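Notes, p. 3: input format for complexes.
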Amino acid sequence: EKTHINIVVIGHVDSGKSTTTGHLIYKCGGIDKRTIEKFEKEAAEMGKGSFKYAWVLDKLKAERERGITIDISLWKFETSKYYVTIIDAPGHRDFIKNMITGTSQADCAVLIVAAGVGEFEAGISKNGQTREHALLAYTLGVKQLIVGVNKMDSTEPPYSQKRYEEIVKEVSTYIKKIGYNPDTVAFVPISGWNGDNMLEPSANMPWFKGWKVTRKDGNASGTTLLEALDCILPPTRPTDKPLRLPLQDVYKIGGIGTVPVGRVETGVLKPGMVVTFAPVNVTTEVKSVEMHHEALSEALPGDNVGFNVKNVSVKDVRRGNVAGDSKNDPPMEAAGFTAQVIILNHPGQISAGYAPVLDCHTAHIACKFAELKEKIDRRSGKKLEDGPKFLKSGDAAIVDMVPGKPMCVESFSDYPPLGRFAVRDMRQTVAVGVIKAVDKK
Amino acid sequence: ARGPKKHLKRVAAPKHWMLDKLTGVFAPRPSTGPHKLRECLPLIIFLRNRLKYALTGDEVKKICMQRFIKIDGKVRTDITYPAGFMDVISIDKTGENFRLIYDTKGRFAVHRITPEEAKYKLCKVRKIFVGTKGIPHLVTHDARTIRYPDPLIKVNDTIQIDLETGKITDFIKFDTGNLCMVTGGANLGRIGVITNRERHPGSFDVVHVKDANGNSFATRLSNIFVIGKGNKPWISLPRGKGIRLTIAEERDKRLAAKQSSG
Amino acid sequence: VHGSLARAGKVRGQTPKVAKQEKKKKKTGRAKRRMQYNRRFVNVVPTFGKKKGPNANS
Amino acid sequence: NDTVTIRTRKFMTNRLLQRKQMVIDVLHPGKATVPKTEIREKLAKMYKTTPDVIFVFGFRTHFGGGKTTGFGMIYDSLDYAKKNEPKHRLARHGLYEKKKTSRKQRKERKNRMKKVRGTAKANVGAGKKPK
Amino acid sequence: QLIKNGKKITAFVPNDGCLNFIEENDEVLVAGFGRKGHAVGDIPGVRFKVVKVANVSLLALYKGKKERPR
Amino acid sequence: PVARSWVCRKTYVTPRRPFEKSRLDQELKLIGEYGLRNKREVWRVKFTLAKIRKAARELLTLDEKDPRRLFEGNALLRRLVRIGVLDEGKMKLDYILGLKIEDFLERRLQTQVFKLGLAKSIHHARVLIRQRHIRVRKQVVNIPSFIVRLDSQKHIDFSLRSPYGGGRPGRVKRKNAKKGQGGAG
RNA sequence: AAUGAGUCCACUUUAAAUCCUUUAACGAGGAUCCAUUGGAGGGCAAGUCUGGUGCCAGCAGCCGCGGUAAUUCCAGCUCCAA
RNA sequence: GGUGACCACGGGUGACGGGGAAUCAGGGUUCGAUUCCGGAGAGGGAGCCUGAGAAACGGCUACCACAUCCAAGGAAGGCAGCA
RNA sequence: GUCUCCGUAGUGUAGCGGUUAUCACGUUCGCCUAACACGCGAAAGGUCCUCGGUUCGAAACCGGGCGGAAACACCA
Ligand SMILES: [Mg+2]
Ligand SMILES: [Mg+2]
Ligand SMILES: [Mg+2]
Ligand SMILES: [Mg+2]
Ligand SMILES: [Mg+2]
Ligand SMILES: [Mg+2]
Ligand SMILES: [Mg+2]
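Output follows (1147 residues plus magnesium ion):
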């Protein structure tokens, strides 16, 4: 056998992002009816009864009282074919840094847009966040995803054809523009708040006859979300590649001490060898490893686990640090690195000395562009000219930068899950690219 | 403690057991029995360290449970049974008998005896009282009590208890001029003749004893076991005849032995 | 504060950096004791100097 | 094999455990410590017995090679050897099997069985589910 | 200011350029300055000296054997 | 609790005052003459002689004919003549005070093999002993500070496995031989 | 010529291992397979060497050194102690 | 009535007592939480059942202080044992 | 992780969408002494924490990130 797959959820504010996944987790059997009714009664007093299914993922009290997701959160459930976990996204312009962590620790994704009028238009727009989310998924390494349109119950007429088509074609041509394949991605109509079309075909809407998806591995046909996600592509596992592990968070659990939590990218982690954390350069034996409060003998790649380490404190190791085996090549602090970047949109010109924030896997560090080497054509990596003096949108170039704060990075030619990065500024993804050459301290 | 102790630390064990330090943390801790634990020799160390018949407590337990160890004519399966002073140890499978007697250095020696001598045993009477229906009684230095003794027997005399019957065959009165043995204190294991007895009412009586060589010492009355009529012992004395010789004449004995053996 | 801390490390900053000469390893232990015993107990000098010390700056 | 010699000392026999025990020293002037297997049949030839009742252990080699000293134990009969001899030496000779679980797991099973009272099928099923 | 009991003391920084290794809010280790609560030398009223800063020895930083925790 | 022993004692005492020319020069002279590694293993023999002298002085303070004095005096004199630092006929407690640490240092195995001529120098003797070439009776000794008794004096000899008694030459000798046969046919 | 510190087969050890002791086969010429920690005015063993600094930086347990020719700071070289 | 300058009584202790440890001319001065003996305690007090032996706490009861689960009706705690 | 505030020479801060300055100072240089002491006059010292956007132009108007000062949660 059974393979573990990480699914993330991306969408908008009040887009049913947590509501539909609460319905999904209840219907697949992650929680029970008594707990969900307790959520209902807790929502009853302060009137946010629409989000009684959203509170399954919104564990934070501030999240509940504000009605929006602040930080990513995890759940487990077992489908009819394999074992998967799910991460929510905040779905907010401000918490992009929170959601990109979850989308980085992802093997696959689902994208949610509300079908009602007045929300889809703002959802896909220049200020819209669906564009940014779908872009950053491919940028960080979400190879395949699925899309589920939500809240067509609020449409007039509810559950309609033309409303579905006018938006699936728009998102299909957008993902064709960005790189994704509309043929590969499955399109699922779901009524979140009513809880429809997850396990069985809802007979209130018969106009949808089910999607057919084609892919290089094979072909599938789906009618429900479960049928969609039970035929996803199983990702490859770089087990032979040495251990690398970005740390999503660090906890101080009573009775066992400091437990970092992160998703195993490369290599196999098992209790019984020393590891090194790169940015802080500390060496430590691992004591135990554990996924979802269940012990594991090995931590295969693609496993989001919390692992217990000894004789260190919580302050020594923080978010964004990458760990690796000391017996193999140890990850360690990089003074600089060369990246092939693709600038997306910037109101002004980009020159040397520009210091945006580069978001790579879990780390979010401001990096200052040391200098520019050359400009690159959009395709074929074509040499254009040497020594650029300014940069504009829709252009590619080789730029060498040094992070102001200590940061560990890996070249895409070596560690593909660590070579992906994004650049964020003014609440839009200014640049995207990969890392080619890295020096070591 | 909230009750009786049932452990014995290795270093707190009696010195005459000759137990080392590095083999363990604990000592045999002899069970309750006829003799106090300070002056008893448990069978585990008797058969493991004095005779080397066993290498481990498990092996001496196997030997004991196979019912070969007969003490005072009775089979004892206790691994930590307190043997004590001049109890006959009998092994019929290997066909020898042992009498547990202190040496000149105040330690229990491996003393081998003939079966006909082993058939009897000396005891020191510790109290004589009359019980109900006017029945005289006699409690020896063991826990052994007997009824209807000879009325001539008084306190701290010696009696000859033949085994398999437990009755009295003969006795030695505690009298000046009788062969004794010191069963406690510094002079533990010294054979000599009772020469004098000074008695202090309300306190301990001190008896002065001169050995064969003329070295006169003294000891408390409770530490004396009369073992012979005048000067001939009623038992077989160990090597050295209980004559404590000082280190000055022990060293040259060692040198003469080395010279003879080399 | 009076403002006089700015001169911290001044001389250790201005000191020119001259490298250590790469030289032969020194014998250690019994060999070292043998060598320094041989230097100062078995040797004859015909020169005057009133028993000048071992680190004489001649 | 060409120059290997067994010598016995402190030899004694006890019928209490029905055996003859001694301390032996073997001289291997230029070779490693002689294998316990080799001592077994060499001492068996020495005492005209078979190399399956022979029991040796505790072989420590003196500094500088040459002599090594161990403790030799020979029985009159293999049934007695099976009866009064440690299970680890029996397993060393292959006559005893220690195919069993860990002490930790055994304690876990005991503590879980403490939680189930009386009921035979549940008390035996206590360790069935949490393997 | 000492972590225990919150008492405020003055501690010497004993080498040529070891003050630049000290910044604000550092956690320093201070030992006695030589003669049991009595001032030493021409330094008035100072009875303690810094041995370590931020869990790295001042001697190590002065000799360059290891670096400040960046 | 534990069944350890932790019965240990130091074997040496540091001098009272450091940096004094006379003591430094005399200790260095002994080190150079006897091939010692450091000042610690001459302070050790000084401590042993100090303990012996203190015991002898304590015994001398006791009355003559006192059996403890007699017994321990004869025992100490017997040990001293066994290690050979004292003459067999000099069986007096007075002569113990006349002993010097040179007498004890002369009885080391390192000096004994050099005096017997098994080595070309005292340092050659020390390294020869450390490399397991010298044996006493039958046991090989690799301890330079092995005090040699008078009876063991005559039995000092080369080790049988060493490339000086029996055969089995050294690793460099065998490498040179295989180089010779590989270079010259 | 001789050896280990290491690699490493086997025996041995041991409840089972480990380590030590044995013993194969590799294993040293900057034998780079590299000894450090503190000092060189006095107490107190060791430099009136050379270059910087110039009452500054700093050293100095104590006397004291440093304000342009520092036996005491910062360094190089060389010596001293363990 | 009893005890007190032959120091009662009170207070302090960074006091568990001892065997012992460091230092070492002699005499001493410090240290002994720490593997042996004896005592005390099991978060703080207190009260008990059983049993030969406990005012037991890897026994119970109650209060106080912390603190776990809970469907809020209840229920369950004691690492100065080994980790 | 979220939120609140602060960040201009080296400290103390004036400051304007069209000018960053001075002051107690801090430093240096002349200024008298062998060394001082006191005392006189000049100079340097700014990417306005950093990066960008709006604008014809920003330190200041805004979006970030950084550090500091406060608070709230965060238990594989
Ligand atoms: Mg110098
Ligand atoms: Mg106390
Ligand atoms: Mg104590
Ligand atoms: Mg105790
Ligand atoms: Mg109690
Ligand atoms: Mg009872
Ligand atoms: Mg209680």
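Residues 30-41 of chain C form the longest helix (12 residues).
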